[PDB]
Design a protein around this nucleic acid. Structure first.
Length: 49
DNA sequence: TGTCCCCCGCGTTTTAACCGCCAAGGGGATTACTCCCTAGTCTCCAGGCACGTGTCAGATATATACATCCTGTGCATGTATTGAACAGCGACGAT
């Protein structure tokens, strides 16, 4: 890309926190298995706590 | 047009050309004499030329490979141009 190199003066985490506005995110949820078949998918996940 | 040098002109130095006169024999010119050689003449015939003929060395036509002659691509390199990334200075608000 052209131009100079720039930084985020106030921490770059302001982007993903703003992008998460209005979404249905399941925090503290680790995925174990991922099942995929011809008629659908099934995701097995557990709680990190 | 521009340079460098190669002759031209001129004074002074060096050489032998030129003339005048004598001394000598080498060789060319001239004559007299003899015979060997060539022009002229005749007869004899084959060497040389015209004429005819047969054919292969060479000119002609047509197809291909070789040479070359010149212009147009490429390359490479240097240079010019432009964009970008270092560098102000000052006014403002936040601390």
């Amino acid at each position: 890309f052209t131009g100079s190199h720039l930084t985020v003066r106030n921490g770059y985490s302001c982007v993903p926190v703003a992008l998460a506005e209005g979404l249905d995110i399941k925090l503290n949820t680790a995925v174990r298995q991922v099942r995929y078949t011809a008629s659908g998918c099934e995701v097995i996940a557990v709680n990190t706590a």
